Amino acid sequence: GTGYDLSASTFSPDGRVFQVEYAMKAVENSSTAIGIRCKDGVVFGVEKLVLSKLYEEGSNKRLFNVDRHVGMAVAGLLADARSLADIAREEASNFRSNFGYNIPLKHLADRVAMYVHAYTLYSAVRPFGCSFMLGSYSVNDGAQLYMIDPSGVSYGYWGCAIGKARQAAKTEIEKLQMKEMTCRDIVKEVAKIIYIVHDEVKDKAFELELSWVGELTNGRHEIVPKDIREEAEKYAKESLKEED
Amino acid sequence: GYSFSLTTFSPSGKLVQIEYALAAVAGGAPSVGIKAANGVVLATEKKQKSILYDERSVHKVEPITKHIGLVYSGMGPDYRVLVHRARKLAQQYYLVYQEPIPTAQLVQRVASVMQEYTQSGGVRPFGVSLLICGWNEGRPYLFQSDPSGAYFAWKATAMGKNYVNGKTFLEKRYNEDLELEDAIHTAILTLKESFEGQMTEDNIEVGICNEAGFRRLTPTEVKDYLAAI
Amino acid sequence: DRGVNTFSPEGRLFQVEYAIEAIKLGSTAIGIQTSEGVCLAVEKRITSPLMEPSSIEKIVEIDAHIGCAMSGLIADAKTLIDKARVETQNHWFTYNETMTVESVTQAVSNLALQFGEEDADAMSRPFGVALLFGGVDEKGPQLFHMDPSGTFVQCDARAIGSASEGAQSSLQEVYHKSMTLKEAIKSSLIILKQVMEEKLNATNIELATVQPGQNFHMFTKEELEEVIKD
Amino acid sequence: GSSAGFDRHITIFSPEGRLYQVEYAFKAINQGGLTSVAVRGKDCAVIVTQKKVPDKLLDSSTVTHLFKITENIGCVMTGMTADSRSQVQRARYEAANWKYKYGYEIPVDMLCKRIADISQVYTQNAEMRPLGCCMILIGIDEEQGPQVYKCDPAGYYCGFKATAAGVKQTESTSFLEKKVKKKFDWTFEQTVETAITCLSTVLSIDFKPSEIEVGVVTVENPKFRILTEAEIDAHLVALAE
Amino acid sequence: SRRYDSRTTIFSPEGRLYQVEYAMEAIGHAGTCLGILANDGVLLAAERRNIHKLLDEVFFSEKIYKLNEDMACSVAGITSDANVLTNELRLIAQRYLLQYQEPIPCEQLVTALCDIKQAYTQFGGKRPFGVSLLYIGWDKHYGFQLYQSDPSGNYGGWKATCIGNNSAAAVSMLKQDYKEGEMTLKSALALAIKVLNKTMLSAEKVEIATLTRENGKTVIRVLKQKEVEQLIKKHEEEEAKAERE
Amino acid sequence: NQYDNDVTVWSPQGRIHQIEYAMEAVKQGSATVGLKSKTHAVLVALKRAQSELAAHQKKILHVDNHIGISIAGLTADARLLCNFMRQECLDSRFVFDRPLPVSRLVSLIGSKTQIPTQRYGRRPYGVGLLIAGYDDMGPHIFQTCPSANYFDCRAMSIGARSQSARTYLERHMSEFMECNLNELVKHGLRALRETLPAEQDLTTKNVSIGIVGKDLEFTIYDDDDVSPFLEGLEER
Amino acid sequence: TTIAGLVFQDGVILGADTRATNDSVVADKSCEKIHFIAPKIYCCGAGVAADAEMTTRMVASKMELHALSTGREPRVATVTRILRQTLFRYQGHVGASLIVGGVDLTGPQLYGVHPHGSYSRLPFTALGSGQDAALAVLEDRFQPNMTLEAAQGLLVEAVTAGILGDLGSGGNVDACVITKTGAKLLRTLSSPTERSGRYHFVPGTTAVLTQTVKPLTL
Amino acid sequence: TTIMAVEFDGGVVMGSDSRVSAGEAVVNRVFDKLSPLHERIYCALSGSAADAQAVADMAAYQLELHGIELEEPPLVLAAANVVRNISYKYREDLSAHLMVAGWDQREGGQVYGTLGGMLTRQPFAIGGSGSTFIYGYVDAAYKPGMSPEECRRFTTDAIALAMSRDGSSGGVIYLVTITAAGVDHRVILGNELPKFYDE
Numbered sequence A: 001g002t003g004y005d006l007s008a009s010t011f012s013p014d015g016r017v018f019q020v021e022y023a024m025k026a027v028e029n030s031s032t033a034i035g036i037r038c039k040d041g042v043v044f045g046v047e048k049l050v051l052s053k054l055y056e057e058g059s060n061k062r063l064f065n066v067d068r069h070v071g072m073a074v075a076g077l078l079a080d081a082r083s084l085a086d087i088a089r090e091e092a093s094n095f096r097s098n099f100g101y102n103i104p105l106k107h108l109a110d111r112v113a114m115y116v117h118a119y120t121l122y123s124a125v126r127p128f129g130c131s132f133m134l135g136s137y138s139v140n141d142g143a144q145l146y147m148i149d150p151s152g153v154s155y156g157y158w159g160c161a162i163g164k165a166r167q168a169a170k171t172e173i174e175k176l177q178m179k180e181m182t183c184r185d186i187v188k189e190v191a192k193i194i195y196i197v198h199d200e201v202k203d204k205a206f207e208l209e210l211s212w213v214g215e216l217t218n219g220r221h222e223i224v225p226k227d228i229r230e231e232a233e234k235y236a237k238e239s240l241k242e243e244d
Numbered sequence B: 001g002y003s004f005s006l007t008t009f010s011p012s013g014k015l016v017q018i019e020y021a022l023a024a025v026a027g028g029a030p031s032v033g034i035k036a037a038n039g040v041v042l043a044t045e046k047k048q049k050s051i052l053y054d055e056r057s058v059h060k061v062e063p064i065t066k067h068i069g070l071v072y073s074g075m076g077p078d079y080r081v082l083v084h085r086a087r088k089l090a091q092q093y094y095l096v097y098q099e100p101i102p103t104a105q106l107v108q109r110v111a112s113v114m115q116e117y118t119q120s121g122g123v124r125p126f127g128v129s130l131l132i133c134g135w136n137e138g139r140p141y142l143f144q145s146d147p148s149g150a151y152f153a154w155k156a157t158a159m160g161k162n163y164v165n166g167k168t169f170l171e172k173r174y175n176e177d178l179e180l181e182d183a184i185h186t187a188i189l190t191l192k193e194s195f196e197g198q199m200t201e202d203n204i205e206v207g208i209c210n211e212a213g214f215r216r217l218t219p220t221e222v223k224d225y226l227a228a229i
Numbered sequence C: 001d002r003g004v005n006t007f008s009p010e011g012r013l014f015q016v017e018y019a020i021e022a023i024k025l026g027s028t029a030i031g032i033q034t035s036e037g038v039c040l041a042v043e044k045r046i047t048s049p050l051m052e053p054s055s056i057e058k059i060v061e062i063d064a065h066i067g068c069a070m071s072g073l074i075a076d077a078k079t080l081i082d083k084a085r086v087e088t089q090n091h092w093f094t095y096n097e098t099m100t101v102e103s104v105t106q107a108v109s110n111l112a113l114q115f116g117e118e119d120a121d122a123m124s125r126p127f128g129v130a131l132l133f134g135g136v137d138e139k140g141p142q143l144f145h146m147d148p149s150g151t152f153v154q155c156d157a158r159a160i161g162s163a164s165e166g167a168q169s170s171l172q173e174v175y176h177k178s179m180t181l182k183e184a185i186k187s188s189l190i191i192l193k194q195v196m197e198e199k200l201n202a203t204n205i206e207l208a209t210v211q212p213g214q215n216f217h218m219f220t221k222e223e224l225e226e227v228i229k230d
Numbered sequence D: 001g002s003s004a005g006f007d008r009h010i011t012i013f014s015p016e017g018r019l020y021q022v023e024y025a026f027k028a029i030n031q032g033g034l035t036s037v038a039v040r041g042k043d044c045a046v047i048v049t050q051k052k053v054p055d056k057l058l059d060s061s062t063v064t065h066l067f068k069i070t071e072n073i074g075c076v077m078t079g080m081t082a083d084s085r086s087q088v089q090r091a092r093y094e095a096a097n098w099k100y101k102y103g104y105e106i107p108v109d110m111l112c113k114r115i116a117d118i119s120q121v122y123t124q125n126a127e128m129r130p131l132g133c134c135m136i137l138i139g140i141d142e143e144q145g146p147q148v149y150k151c152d153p154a155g156y157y158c159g160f161k162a163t164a165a166g167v168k169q170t171e172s173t174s175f176l177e178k179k180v181k182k183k184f185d186w187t188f189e190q191t192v193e194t195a196i197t198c199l200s201t202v203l204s205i206d207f208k209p210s211e212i213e214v215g216v217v218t219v220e221n222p223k224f225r226i227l228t229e230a231e232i233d234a235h236l237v238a239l240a241e
Numbered sequence E: 001s002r003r004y005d006s007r008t009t010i011f012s013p014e015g016r017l018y019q020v021e022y023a024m025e026a027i028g029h030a031g032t033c034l035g036i037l038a039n040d041g042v043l044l045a046a047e048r049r050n051i052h053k054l055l056d057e058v059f060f061s062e063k064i065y066k067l068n069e070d071m072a073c074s075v076a077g078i079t080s081d082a083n084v085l086t087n088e089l090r091l092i093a094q095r096y097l098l099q100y101q102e103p104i105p106c107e108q109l110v111t112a113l114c115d116i117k118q119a120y121t122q123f124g125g126k127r128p129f130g131v132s133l134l135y136i137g138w139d140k141h142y143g144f145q146l147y148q149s150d151p152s153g154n155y156g157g158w159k160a161t162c163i164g165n166n167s168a169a170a171v172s173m174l175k176q177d178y179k180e181g182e183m184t185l186k187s188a189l190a191l192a193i194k195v196l197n198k199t200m201l202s203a204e205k206v207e208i209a210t211l212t213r214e215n216g217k218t219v220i221r222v223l224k225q226k227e228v229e230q231l232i233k234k235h236e237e238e239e240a241k242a243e244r245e
Numbered sequence F: 001n002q003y004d005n006d007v008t009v010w011s012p013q014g015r016i017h018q019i020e021y022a023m024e025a026v027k028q029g030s031a032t033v034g035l036k037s038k039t040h041a042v043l044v045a046l047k048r049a050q051s052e053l054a055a056h057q058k059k060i061l062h063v064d065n066h067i068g069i070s071i072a073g074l075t076a077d078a079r080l081l082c083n084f085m086r087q088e089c090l091d092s093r094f095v096f097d098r099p100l101p102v103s104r105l106v107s108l109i110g111s112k113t114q115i116p117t118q119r120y121g122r123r124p125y126g127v128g129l130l131i132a133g134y135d136d137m138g139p140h141i142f143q144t145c146p147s148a149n150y151f152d153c154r155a156m157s158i159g160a161r162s163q164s165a166r167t168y169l170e171r172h173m174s175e176f177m178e179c180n181l182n183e184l185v186k187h188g189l190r191a192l193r194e195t196l197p198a199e200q201d202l203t204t205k206n207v208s209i210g211i212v213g214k215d216l217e218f219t220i221y222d223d224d225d226v227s228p229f230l231e232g233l234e235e236r
Numbered sequence G: 001t002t003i004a005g006l007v008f009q010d011g012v013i014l015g016a017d018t019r020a021t022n023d024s025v026v027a028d029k030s031c032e033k034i035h036f037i038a039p040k041i042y043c044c045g046a047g048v049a050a051d052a053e054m055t056t057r058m059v060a061s062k063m064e065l066h067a068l069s070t071g072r073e074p075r076v077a078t079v080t081r082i083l084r085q086t087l088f089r090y091q092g093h094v095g096a097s098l099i100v101g102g103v104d105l106t107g108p109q110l111y112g113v114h115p116h117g118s119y120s121r122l123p124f125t126a127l128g129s130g131q132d133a134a135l136a137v138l139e140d141r142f143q144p145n146m147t148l149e150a151a152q153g154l155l156v157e158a159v160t161a162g163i164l165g166d167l168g169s170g171g172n173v174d175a176c177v178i179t180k181t182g183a184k185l186l187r188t189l190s191s192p193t194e195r196s197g198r199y200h201f202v203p204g205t206t207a208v209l210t211q212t213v214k215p216l217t218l
Numbered sequence H: 001t002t003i004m005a006v007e008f009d010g011g012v013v014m015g016s017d018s019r020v021s022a023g024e025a026v027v028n029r030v031f032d033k034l035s036p037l038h039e040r041i042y043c044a045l046s047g048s049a050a051d052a053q054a055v056a057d058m059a060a061y062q063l064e065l066h067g068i069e070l071e072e073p074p075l076v077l078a079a080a081n082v083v084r085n086i087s088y089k090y091r092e093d094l095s096a097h098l099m100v101a102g103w104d105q106r107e108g109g110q111v112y113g114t115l116g117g118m119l120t121r122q123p124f125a126i127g128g129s130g131s132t133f134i135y136g137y138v139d140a141a142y143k144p145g146m147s148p149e150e151c152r153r154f155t156t157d158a159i160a161l162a163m164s165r166d167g168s169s170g171g172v173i174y175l176v177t178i179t180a181a182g183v184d185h186r187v188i189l190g191n192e193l194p195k196f197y198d199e
């Protein structure tokens, strides 16, 4: 439609808020980010497209620490993604202040999702051009992974993908039996899927960002160390020849 | 928010959103109000789309305080804002003055609120005309108030679908010292002109106002008046 | 129809763009920086002999050591001149010293893009005014230009107004860096007489100078009539 | 369908007296691609909707349109999921705040009225759109017995003997008005099975346990019970004949 | 937001305010409201647009509003806008009285409302109040007074004037027949009914009031339907008596 | 076109044209280059003169003892965003008695400049910065933009004809980390004049340098100050 | 002031004296301290007379608003909550000591509400300057589930003990029985205490300087 | 006032007196000072009644909505922090001490003190005016690993000993026993109080 697509305070005749849909297209044009729920935690992998070799490694970091126990992986307009991380950091900080313990991930997902939803109702502001995945592990709650989109919908996921290769990444995840496998295993298979769905012909070269949270890390969202990342990058390259 | 009027003057010199709001009233489910010598009647069509609708739940004919009542034609949600506000305005008078609010004065206060949304920032006016029954010194009162925020004291009138037919029907058939028995019967006959279906205790709603304040009539009380038609 | 804080595809604010366009309508003014002093000259553009000539103050005293010449919307300028005048005496109050010509110009340059609609108390549009500051501080005699964007820079010589384009070509040929003040004063009145479609005289213009020894002085009828010669 | 000014872009009147932006919020309920049904028994009240899990990679527990507002009250949403969650958060706030201010359990009509009055503000003020969603509340009133209460994006609300909302609303309300006219002893079994068969025969699907989700309140257990897939399986096989 | 803005408070290219002019066109459709000054009093006479068999007649007036003890006014335009403005006029009259302990002078009360009406034309982005008012009053400075105002927030003092339907036709008719310094309230009442006979004659359709000073205190009273109907028959007889001769 | 005027209006392409228009303010603005070694961080700026009579435009600004910047865009947004950095630095020296980490300062710029891109009747900051600074993690070059995105860098260039500079820098990356100060400044100067045409080249009037490292605070070099650095290699 | 309350089998009875004192001088002999809140909710006024007056006025209006909206007879827990949270915000400066009594859906209910915003649900209570005399009478002879006749007699005896015993308290016993079927407002239920007078001055004994007569004529 | 909470294997016992004083006058001799915050979380009210109730109402309101937002029963650490933060924020203005205790699926039976906006988990705690007189007894008589019945005995003995000595404490002993199974409320009357030396 045209005429009805300028403001988030305006429905179209078909019953659609095109400003929210256009914010989701900025995510669909952005690069692929994925994450899978293991037995003993959650792992994140991101296709970070290098615009120039002039930039340092660990610049434009699309993986973030929201809390000590929670990890955020983003895809879309990156400025909006960082401000969403700042919202989630403060929102998690408010829970610790109010209730004296670590925020549950479903609650953290819901409270930040309603922040995202608030920007889809008014002419005065625009939606966030960003989908992101929140992931966590705990003693009692266990492994949990949630994804939020520009509209403000929050669902829980065993496996999830957002970006260029949204559909293409998901059919590769469906092959893996994530429920039985562990975080130690899944880092190889997450690194594999990024290398598959990466278009070498269209796009430039890329850096694989890997983070995780699990029993391995004592429910703490850390980066995957250079020992394990480079093992998984090696596994990705050599097993790409095995199906080519 | 938006700090500018959505209702504005056209080259002809007409506040277009008010006349468009009157079209929303004019295409609403019809409503009638009649002033007897000893009392006041308010009646309206409550014909919902299915038998699935619980008839006892929500009401068109609503009280404001113990001596004033209310009914509408047009937009239902807009009406409920005016009911809540009118109820507050009644108590704000009673708290200050320790006297039951005059019906004229309640209409004037709600009129001022209805006028507010024809000028203030970022808001359309109400798609509602109200009919306000009452009892003050020792005598009946009936008032209309329409989306403009203008108000008119009526002996009798109609609203909604076939309001032109209801008004002419009433003009010839209304007498200026009717009994409240007869006026309740007249109000149902005014609705039966514009009706599409067989009438019942459920699918219409009536309230009355007299010496002992305002109340909504029960289904069985209505059923007695429906028996002799 | 669009907002005041809207970029063009070229990458610049429409209202700032159009504020530069407003200075072309304004009457021309020249300032020349020399080692012996900064002179400042401007045309009054008198539309009637009934209009009192002395009450068109287009060069004004900011302080005893600084002046400012203006072109464009004359009313818009008086807001900025007063804010500069306030800033200098606020600085004198706090620090017991004179401001530099750069420091004053910067303070006025901070106000240039302080406009907008939503999130405001405040200005709707920019100031459609170019200012030629000219004074003498601890770093010798200095002349500074400012435009509606907020861009400000030191100038050896510069002009602004309707014949800014025409006068700058004449300044290129005429200007020499080791010249005297009295040569620079007479240079301006030569360059002004050409561009004015009215004829140059003591009532039709304002001149003013600032030296190291002497304060800001605006020239009288008698002092202008002596220079008039050339 | 006459139009002038910005009447299709913002919530202001058309020449006919309609609000086109309100009407478009009703079309936005259908975009979810789901239909909800709600039914009132003699001693209970039940809600049912499609628990559509196309992706196996979803956690099917977190996929739900049934929500707990208080202990004694729960609702089914239908429409835009972001709007639906947002309207549920506000229902929880207003319900809790009622118990703080007034010291008793909010009744089901007043919670539904409160949300409907909030929806009207969007219906009148141009600055924001209406929420493209539809809340159907259920709960046991102490005086009045069990209650079913819908409210629209327009700001309407009403009590119902049974109701539906979503894609196949008109077919579901057509099915329910046929069955309500016939006499039944409206027990917990009668009320639940009418809701599932209404949603089944309208959509023309024999449901499995994972393909639906059921919420309910009885006279004996008035706390908001969301039935498990095992409990759903018993009612489906009861309709084997 | 910027797309949806009507922009009520701006100059059009000609050098004028559209919503102010368009509001004065609304007044030109509304009922014929006039006022006439005299030596021994002031009057207002208005066309009564609320005319039906089934109307109740609660209030002492319909278009006429009392403001202070020594002042009153009538209106022409949107009646809801008039109820706001008249309420505010009454507030101003008492705000002056609380402050000084004298009645507000008539020009001062009119300027106070007209400063508010002008604000709605200059700022706020709001539509103006679509009402012209005719004011009557007495004060210790200028005595018997008549004022006109309009949606712009502009006012003037008049000996006799009109607003509403057939405004210009009524003023030109008043310019013929009004004699300055020589008019009493009885002669003014004859001219009021003469002009309303041209523009609009039953007494339900007419509504008159007379401000006068009797025994050191101002007396504002609406005329009853017996007083109006006898004045209508006096016009009909005086019109017919000239027609024969 | 419909999606050009307001920052809140998403295009059907999935783009915000008022950001992308604000990016063009940097590009039409003058050229400037930034790079770092193991020990130092250097900024080099081609100062654009208005006319040949008027003095050259100030392109490198001071923020703290440990941070300074070079600009490209609207000078008022440059000065506004400079004062924000100066103040957040001042807050950190006041509160903690310790210089503000450069990555943390750069994060606050991104947070700040993002705010108006999402709000109606507001605009992005029409200015791109190259931010040189030294801290506990050694020297840094950071980039910022109107889009509120920021980049950690080995080196960078921005402004008019800055593609030429970026091509030069991408070749000599591994050289920069090993270089001494004089070799690192000379590298940045060669990247800058690659943006210029063959007719005109670097002089003491039209070049400014800004240097910070382990030994030195953020010093700025403009006129005779620059003369030591230029006199080394000058051909092509 | 002596005000008191009492829960019995079919309902609640609320008692109050009629004296209103200004310092140590009797201003009013006959005044109603039992105020209307709802049809089957009444409230006794003690402490600062204006604060007792205006809070009970205000909550009555709030219950009328609440009842009209709900379409239900109001709960006695709701009046207590509204009073508390009003009174708590003002930190006891609104000095209204109140006994709130009524019947609703959940049975007969009596609440003591103090001016700082504390409350107590009770079967019997007393407040005001002669609370102790009335509360002593209640402790001596209260039992659970009294008759309508015995409760009136006990509650009259409680308020009477204050009337005689407390210098602040005086005059008649007003009362209010709130059964299930409505509320019976027994004003002047008792009169514990029972002249010559006549000081007829002749017209003209008072000397007069000015006289003005303003006739009115309707 | 005398209040007391005690911790054990899979639950907490929680006890108060029943006297609301106004100097030498007893305003209410039968006041329940154990107010519910959630289904399995109580608090023992102490100090200013108006202050103590208002915090309990606000904590109950906050914890009701917090519980529904998680789709779970709130933690006792959460309810202890809700009471802590209110008491701390308005510590100058309020003059009350709300001892909070209950049961969790996570950490089980637990007792927290919130004296003047602090927070501390103890195996037992005591509060109010009458707690002064029984610090010796609770130190003497407490040993770890008590049953529900041993805790109910100990809470009754301590509060009865205080009620004997403290003028501001008196009336009946109200008792609450919170476990996974539920909440057992019980009222030990003034008739059947455990006798000690009282001369």
Ligand SMILES: *[B]([O])([O])[C]([C][C]([C])[C])[N]C(=O)C1=[C]N([C][C][N]C(=O)C2=C(O[C])C(O[C])=C(O[C])[C]=[C]2)N=N1
Residues within 6 Å of the ligand: H001, H002, H019, H020, H021, H022, H023, H024, H031, H033, H045, H046, H047, H048, H049, H050, H052, H128, H129, H168
């Ligand atoms: B308990 O803490 O005694 C009890 C607990 C409640 C939860 C029911 N609280 C009360 O009984 C109580 C007392 N008051 C107000 C009366 N104040 C005092 O008694 C008081 C006094 O006065 C004797 C004094 O000194 C005179 C002090 O010391 C400054 C403190 C309190 N409200 N509730």
Ligand code: NA
Residues within 6 Å of the ligand: D010, D011, D121, D122, D123, D124, D125, D126, D127, D128, D129, D130
């Ligand atoms: Na709206």
Ligand code: NA
Residues within 6 Å of the ligand: G162, G163, G164, G165, G166, G167, G168, G169, G170
């Ligand atoms: Na006494």
Ligand code: NA
Residues within 6 Å of the ligand: H162, H163, H164, H165, H166, H167, H168, H169, H170
């Ligand atoms: Na004791």
